Design a binder for this molecule. Structure first.
Ligand SMILES: CC[C@H](C)[C@H](NC(=O)[C@@H](NC[C@H](O)[C@@H](N)CC(C)C)C(C)C)C(=O)N[C@@H](Cc1ccccc1)C(=O)OC
Length: 330
């Protein structure tokens, strides 16, 4: 079986992308944030504190005849952004783009963070990291991908984010129609449960490529590109006016300024993010400072290949036994 669904950004800066998902019987469609750096399927619901639901579509486990309590089961997550979600757990049929997974663990929030509450467009998250990270206790659960896998034609899913536009999530197959040239597969370390890979270097605009191993995760759940202090300085050094700021907490640039492109190496191949991808617009409305898309990783612990970077390539998450990450130009 395969499934394809349309992902659409939720705002003009493509701060995140949202995918329609059918949960329940009959079907309740929620828009979830597909998160390849998290292992939890969670959604706003019928139990969620009514002080923390503001415009989101809710999943009503009451109205699904396929829905049952996982009695005793419970979840809690912390995100890198400082996001916090928690509640009870149910088992339900979940369909994504016609790929139906029966008996999927759907994590019903009782409690959600400010961050999620101030976010009207997103109805929950669908984790597509490795199952080791799934939060649910006392009996830990598998992801939707983990559930789909053997049912799939191929144990893979592709990610094809658009820049100011829809893109696509495909499960079970590779559209040879969606990229240009060759896909370069690179080795994945599963050990921390991430889609965890090592980049072969970087170039700043038309400058000379530096060969240097940047260990990082592909995470479609992270908006920007997070890279070592060193790498980040070399980039912003090329934009007049760019400064790192105490108060704003990150690199900014005069919005009148011009972003050189950024190039990252996947093996022998190279991926250009156009400079336009790294403009995240003014820090506050009216401001002539604009916020950059490539930020230091120094304060997080890990380099994140976020949307900024992934949305410049056609990515393939090979969920094989010997998991492999594929990148191609599009
Ligand atoms: C179930 C745990 C998952 C794996 C959780 N994952 C994450 O935080 C990863 N991304 C989290 C999400 O992709 C988030 N950026 C998307 C939005 C919509 C919520 C980071 C590491 C790249 C994590 O490691 N959380 C850390 C907290 C943390 C992580 C990174 C940096 C700082 C602090 C924890 O404590 O485990 C609960």
């Amino acid at each position: 079986s395969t499934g394809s669904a349309t992902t659409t950004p939720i705002d003009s800066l493509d701060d995140a992308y949202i995918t329609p998902v059918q949960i329940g019987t009959p079907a309740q469609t929620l828009n979830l944030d597909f998160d390849t750096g998290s292992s939890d399927l969670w959604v706003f619901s019928s139990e969620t504190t009514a002080s923390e639901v503001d415009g989101q579509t809710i999943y009503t486990p009451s109205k699904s005849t396929t829905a049952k309590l996982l009695s005793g089961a419970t979840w809690s997550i912390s995100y890198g952004d400082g996001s916090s979600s928690s509640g009870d757990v149910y088992t339900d049929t979940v369909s994504v783009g016609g790929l139906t997974v029966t008996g999927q663990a759907v994590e019903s929030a009782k409690k959600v963070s400010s961050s999620f509450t101030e976010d009207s467009t997103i109805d929950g998250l669908l984790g597509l990291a490795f199952s080791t990270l799934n939060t649910v206790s006392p009996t830990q659960q598998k992801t939707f991908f983990d559930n789909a896998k053997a049912s799939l034609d191929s144990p893979v899913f592709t990610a094809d984010l658009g820049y100011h536009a829809p893109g696509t999530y495909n499960f079970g197959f590779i559209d040879t129609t969606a990229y240009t040239g060759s896909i370069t597969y690179t080795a994945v370390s599963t050990k921390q449960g991430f889609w965890e890979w090592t980049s072969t270097g970087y170039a700043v605009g038309s400058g000379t490529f530096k060969s240097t191993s940047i260990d990082g995760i592909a995470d479609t759940g992270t908006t920007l590109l997070y890279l070592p202090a060193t790498v980040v300085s070399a980039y912003w050094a090329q934009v007049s006016g760019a400064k790192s700021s105490s108060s704003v907490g990150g690199y900014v640039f005069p919005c009148s300024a011009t972003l050189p492109s950024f190039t990252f190496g996947v093996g022998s191949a190279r991926i250009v993010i156009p400079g336009d991808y790294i403009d995240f617009g003014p820090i506050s409305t009216g401001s002539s400072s604009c916020f950059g898309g490539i930020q230091s990783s120094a304060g997080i612990g890990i380099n994140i290949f976020g949307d900024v970077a992934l949305k410049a390539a056609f990515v393939v998450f090979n969920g094989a036994t010997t998991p492999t990450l594929g990148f191609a130009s599009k």
